[PDB]
Amino acid sequence: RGSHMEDFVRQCFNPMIVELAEKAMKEYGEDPKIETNKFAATCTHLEVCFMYSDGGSKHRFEIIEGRDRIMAWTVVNSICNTTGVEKPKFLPDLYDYKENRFIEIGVTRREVHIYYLEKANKIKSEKTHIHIFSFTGEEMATKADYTLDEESRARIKTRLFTIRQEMASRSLWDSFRQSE
Numbered sequence: 001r002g003s004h005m006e007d008f009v010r011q012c013f014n015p016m017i018v019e020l021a022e023k024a025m026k027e028y029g030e031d032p033k034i035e036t037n038k039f040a041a042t043c044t045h046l047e048v049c050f051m052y053s054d055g056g057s058k059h060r061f062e063i064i065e066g067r068d069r070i071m072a073w074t075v076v077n078s079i080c081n082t083t084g085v086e087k088p089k090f091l092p093d094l095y096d097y098k099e100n101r102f103i104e105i106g107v108t109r110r111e112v113h114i115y116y117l118e119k120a121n122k123i124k125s126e127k128t129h130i131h132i133f134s135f136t137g138e139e140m141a142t143k144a145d146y147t148l149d150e151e152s153r154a155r156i157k158t159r160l161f162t163i164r165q166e167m168a169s170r171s172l173w174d175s176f177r178q179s180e
């Protein structure tokens with residue numbers, strides 16, 4: 001092992017996000033020491049969800065990402081069985097209480113159009129909202145409803161570009177970009 005990417009991941013993201021990403025990949029049969037770009041991407045996706053949920057009031061979002069698969073489904077079932085929304089086929093990331101809809105947050109190294117289409121084809125569920133960010137400052141949301149005020153989303157974009165810069169400064173961006 002001994003990747004430059006792994007050491008960069010541990011010093012760039014906070015320990016809790018690193019710990020959560022280690023559990024997730026290990027739960028799905030992968031190891032942060034080999035699939036190190038997936039390690040960087042899992043942390044990134046985790047941090048974005050956290051900043052996103054931090055963008056609302058206080059009780060607006062229920063965080064689904066960053067839970068055990070069984071407990072995340074339990075919370076999803078309780079949300080469906082109390083508000084009345086349909087149960088998604090694939091685990092979402094958040095649930096907007098203000099807007100009464102699940103949210104699937106994506107972070108891609110391609111143009112937001114293609115990644116959105118793949119997840120919109122994977123979901124095929126309508127209902128759940130889709131919101132994609134990219135490492136180049138662009139975003140894409142369902143029905144152009146970007147959910148959060150603009151300010152919050154702007155932060156996420158800045159954070160994503162800083163991650164890209166630190167990766168490129170360490171000459172690890174090109175392998176990270178051409179790996180998704």
Ligand SMILES: COc1cc(CCNC(=O)c2[nH]c(-c3ccccc3C(F)(F)F)nc(=O)c2O)ccn1
Pocket residue numbers: 024025028038040041042043045065091092093104105106107
């Ligand atoms: C197939 O690979 C997997 C699958 C899982 C199951 C749980 N996963 C999610 O629920 C999930 N997964 C991804 C994603 C997919 C492939 C590569 C990178 C990511 C990314 F961005 F995290 F970095 N994007 C999301 O938005 C998202 O909600 C875990 C670990 N690996």
Ligand SMILES: [Mn+2]
Pocket residue numbers: 065091092093
């Ligand atoms: Mn998810």
Ligand SMILES: [Mn+2]
Pocket residue numbers: 045093104105106
């Ligand atoms: Mn997601």
